[PDB]
Amino acid sequence: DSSRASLTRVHRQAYARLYPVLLVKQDGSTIHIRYREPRRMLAMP
Amino acid sequence: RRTPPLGPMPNSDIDLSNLERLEKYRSFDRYRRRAEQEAQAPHWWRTYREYFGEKTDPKEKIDIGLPPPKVSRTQQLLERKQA
Amino acid sequence: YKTKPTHGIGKYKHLIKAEEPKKKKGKVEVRAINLGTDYEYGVLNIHLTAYDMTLAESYAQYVHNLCNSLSIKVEESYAMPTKTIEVLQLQDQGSKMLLDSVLTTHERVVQISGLSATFAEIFLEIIQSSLPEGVRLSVKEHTEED
Amino acid sequence: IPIEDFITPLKFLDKARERPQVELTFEETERRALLLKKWSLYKQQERKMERDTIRAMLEAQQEALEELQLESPKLHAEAIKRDPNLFPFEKEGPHYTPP
Amino acid sequence: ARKERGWRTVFPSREFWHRLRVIRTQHHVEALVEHQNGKVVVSASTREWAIKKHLYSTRNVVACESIGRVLAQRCLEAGINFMVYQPTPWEAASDSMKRLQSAMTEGGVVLREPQRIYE
Amino acid sequence: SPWRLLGALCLQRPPVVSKPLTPLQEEMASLLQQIEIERSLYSDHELRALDENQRLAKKKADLAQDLEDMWEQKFLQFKLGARITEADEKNDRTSLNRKLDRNLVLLVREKFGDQDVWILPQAEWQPGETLRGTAERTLATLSENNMEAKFLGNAPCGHYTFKFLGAKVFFFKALLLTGDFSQAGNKGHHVWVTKDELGDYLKPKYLAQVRRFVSDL
RNA sequence: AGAGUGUAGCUUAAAAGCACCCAACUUACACUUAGGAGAUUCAAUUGACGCUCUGA
Numbered sequence A: 001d002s003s004r005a006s007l008t009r010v011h012r013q014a015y016a017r018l019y020p021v022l023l024v025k026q027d028g029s030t031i032h033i034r035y036r037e038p039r040r041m042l043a044m045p
Numbered sequence B: 001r002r003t004p005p006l007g008p009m010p011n012s013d014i015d016l017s018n019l020e021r022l023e024k025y026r027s028f029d030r031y032r033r034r035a036e037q038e039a040q041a042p043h044w045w046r047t048y049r050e051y052f053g054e055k056t057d058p059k060e061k062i063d064i065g066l067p068p069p070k071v072s073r074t075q076q077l078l079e080r081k082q083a
Numbered sequence C: 001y002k003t004k005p006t007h008g009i010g011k012y013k014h015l016i017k018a019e020e021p022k023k024k025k026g027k028v029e030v031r032a033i034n035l036g037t038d039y040e041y042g043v044l045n046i047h048l049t050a051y052d053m054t055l056a057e058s059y060a061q062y063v064h065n066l067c068n069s070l071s072i073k074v075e076e077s078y079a080m081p082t083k084t085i086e087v088l089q090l091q092d093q094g095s096k097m098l099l100d101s102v103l104t105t106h107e108r109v110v111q112i113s114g115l116s117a118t119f120a121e122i123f124l125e126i127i128q129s130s131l132p133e134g135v136r137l138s139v140k141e142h143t144e145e146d
Numbered sequence D: 001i002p003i004e005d006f007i008t009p010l011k012f013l014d015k016a017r018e019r020p021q022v023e024l025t026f027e028e029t030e031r032r033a034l035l036l037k038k039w040s041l042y043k044q045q046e047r048k049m050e051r052d053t054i055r056a057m058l059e060a061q062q063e064a065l066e067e068l069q070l071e072s073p074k075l076h077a078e079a080i081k082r083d084p085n086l087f088p089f090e091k092e093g094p095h096y097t098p099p
Numbered sequence E: 001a002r003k004e005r006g007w008r009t010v011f012p013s014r015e016f017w018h019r020l021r022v023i024r025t026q027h028h029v030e031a032l033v034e035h036q037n038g039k040v041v042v043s044a045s046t047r048e049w050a051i052k053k054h055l056y057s058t059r060n061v062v063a064c065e066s067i068g069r070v071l072a073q074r075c076l077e078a079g080i081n082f083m084v085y086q087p088t089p090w091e092a093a094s095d096s097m098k099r100l101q102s103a104m105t106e107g108g109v110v111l112r113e114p115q116r117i118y119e
Numbered sequence F: 001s002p003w004r005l006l007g008a009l010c011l012q013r014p015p016v017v018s019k020p021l022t023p024l025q026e027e028m029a030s031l032l033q034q035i036e037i038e039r040s041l042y043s044d045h046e047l048r049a050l051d052e053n054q055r056l057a058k059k060k061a062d063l064a065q066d067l068e069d070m071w072e073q074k075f076l077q078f079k080l081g082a083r084i085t086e087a088d089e090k091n092d093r094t095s096l097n098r099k100l101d102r103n104l105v106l107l108v109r110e111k112f113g114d115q116d117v118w119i120l121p122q123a124e125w126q127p128g129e130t131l132r133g134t135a136e137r138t139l140a141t142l143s144e145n146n147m148e149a150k151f152l153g154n155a156p157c158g159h160y161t162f163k164f165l166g167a168k169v170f171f172f173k174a175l176l177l178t179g180d181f182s183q184a185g186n187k188g189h190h191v192w193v194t195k196d197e198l199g200d201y202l203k204p205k206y207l208a209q210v211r212r213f214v215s216d217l
Numbered sequence G: 001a002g003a004g005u006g007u008a009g010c011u012u013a014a015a016a017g018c019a020c021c022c023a024a025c026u027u028a029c030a031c032u033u034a035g036g037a038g039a040u041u042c043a044a045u046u047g048a049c050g051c052u053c054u055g056a
Helices: B029-039 B073-082 C053-069 C117-129 D026-071 D075-080 E061-078 E089-093 E095-107 F023-039 F044-061 F065-077 F131-143 F195-201
Strands: A019-024 A030-035 C044-050 C087-090 C098-101 C104-112 C135-140 E018-024 E029-035 E040-045 F007-012 F105-111 F116-119 F146-151 F171-180 F191-193
Touching (some): C044 C053, C053 C104, C117 D026, D026 D075, D075 F131, E029 E061, E040 E061, F007 F131, F131 F146, F131 F171
Parallel strands (some): F007 F171
Antiparallel strands (some): C044 C135, E018 E029, F105 F116, F146 F171
């Protein structure tokens, strides 16, 4: 049931590049965040 | 002075209360299609068709011709499906 | 004519209740009609917020299609402006200096009119089953001014 | 007063000559079309499955209310009525890496 | 002959001798040429087995072009080649209907029937 | 009217991790990223690569790669959290973290002097209290720990006819927030079980008619 | 163990129309455009496969 809203597209007509970044949370959980400047982890304090 | 309708009113069947719970005609074409399919209903009031030249069409006409050829619709549909 | 059996055939404004209300600033909120044996809610708000605008919008579109297909009334849906969170990055060796990275936070709001007991618990369990990744959900009360 | 963020920045108007090219291949285009067709199949199947689960368990809850009314004449009003406990309802989404 | 002038406030107009009416169902596409009085003279539908057995995606644009071409043929066989077509704005902007009327014109049917003499 | 006072409760568990990816779905991810690549415009690192290289060539006739390689180094150094916490155990069916991809339902095992049934946690509704309150009281008694199992609705779930003196069962539900389990080695055979293992465990029709309200996923 | 039976979700349809879903526009919904998967359980009106309720 989670394979439904995971599929996404950006519908804004003009937009900069987005890249799949592994966002680590405060309890060590990964989120696929579409972020420019193709980093690989953003560790939030 | 009033006279009761000589039959069901066109809009009486639909519910008047809870009109929020009734789906609305979101487009023009669905209303158009409902209107055209209602236009040929046998209304009890005066209408275009009552006056404009139908030659009193409804009456069975005598068929003088060959009987239709007996076909097996099950096998024919199966063959069309395979095609 | 008024004396004829076909009187009142062109009556339509009883069908269209819309008296063209100025529905851009009105605060005529429906309350929770609770009869005991017949419970219904008022205007409960739903807030989905995430760091990803595309996934948040996809979730909003999915719930909107689901609720429109479920045959319950949707009054209005909209979106909150973007929130930017900066990550102040302390260095490994020298912690005194302060660098930074940029990040964004998005939001969208969907509202619901009718909620029966079984129907609304069903809707809640289904939306938690289909809740997506990275999007935080919170259903709250109506009064929320920008 | 609403604050609007559905406006693209004015910096997005000038630099528009970077990637204006779409040079594709018939093979890739037909592959994309076939993929979209199978996507339509999969989404129709998923929607139908979800609808069947929803309808089955909804019929079941209707049976629950009906038989509760039949068996306990006084419990059904309280079973229908809401406690306020689900006013501040909120749930967190899934994750990828478990703690 | 006299065309049914008027009605002048409803849609569509009845001022014609033969109209081209296209019904666009979900599973099928059909088009008819009917006189003003109501009776249809020719029609091409994707339901008809003769063209159903051949064509693909009975709802497709290519399906509606095939419909237009076959009904152009059978209406020429019927001897009718003048008739009007009244679309909604989105139907007139529909590429299916544009290519449909193109198929009609290359089949040899001219729309916009002539005007009455001593109208 | 002799009716034996009995309800029941099913425990739902929210997943923590998402499902495997369909390979049509991964091909779809590739194709949509292709479309995004094609229609994207004005990328910061894109011009910090292209224009920077062009200006470096110009000054040679007279960054981005470093950042990419040290971020790749970061990716190599930070291994992610292990997805598979199930195959390593293979035996702790009683543990909470045994399965995170799906929703799990808890059941308790006890043997009666007449009945031998693997039952979902039952309950005994005293007439002086509401059914939701009885369900949560029984939940506390059977759980003997600190459960924040927040409920969903006062309406019941299921009712299967059993009579010996009529009797009924009234199934309810409650969503679990977070679980700390005291006495992980309870002899009371509680177990965290998904839908497939649920159907495998249902011996009678009474249990076989419980799989239609739980989340089939 | 008995009864009712039966065309894809629905139809006093005889292989249909509504339905259902995908892409484009629309914040979104809606409208429209361009696409998709679909059914008469078998054997000769009769018999024997599936569902339901009643049981035990």
